[PDB]
Design a protein around this nucleic acid. Structure first.
Length: 63
DNA sequence: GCGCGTACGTGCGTTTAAGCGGTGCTAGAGCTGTCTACGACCAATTGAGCGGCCTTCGGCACCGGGATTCTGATGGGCGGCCGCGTAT
């Protein structure tokens, strides 16, 4: 019944180097996240500072 | 008792491999069947084994005889006693 992160769909950049770290992935890339308990038609391009603390976060870290 | 520290329990997510029932294959247990070697049994003779009884040399620790070293009464000779004592 909770509105958490299920799987990851697509990924792109948000703001239009040798190795981008997690900070560059936060303030430089947006990711299409599929939410649990919901169809795949409600995929939204979200990051970390736009959703806050949500259920399930290690999957997007590994991806 | 108390206080500091941290490691181990509880959670979620990721991940890895047990358990399920499906088939195939043949090895190794179990059965089976004939022979005969090896163990039980009975016999008769013999000495290893047990009770009965007292053995001898070597090793621990107490011992043995003879020369030699240290302590004690002995003794003439050089000195000191100053105080009673006989002679003029």
């Amino acid at each position: 019944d909770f509105h958490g992160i299920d799987i990851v769909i697509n990924h792109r950049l948000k703001t239009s180097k040798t190795v981008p770290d997690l900070n560059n992935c936060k303030e430089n890339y947006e990711f299409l996240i599929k939410w649990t308990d919901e169809s795949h038609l409600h995929n939204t391009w979200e990051t970390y500072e736009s959703i806050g603390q949500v259920r399930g976060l290690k999957r997007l870290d590994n991806y």
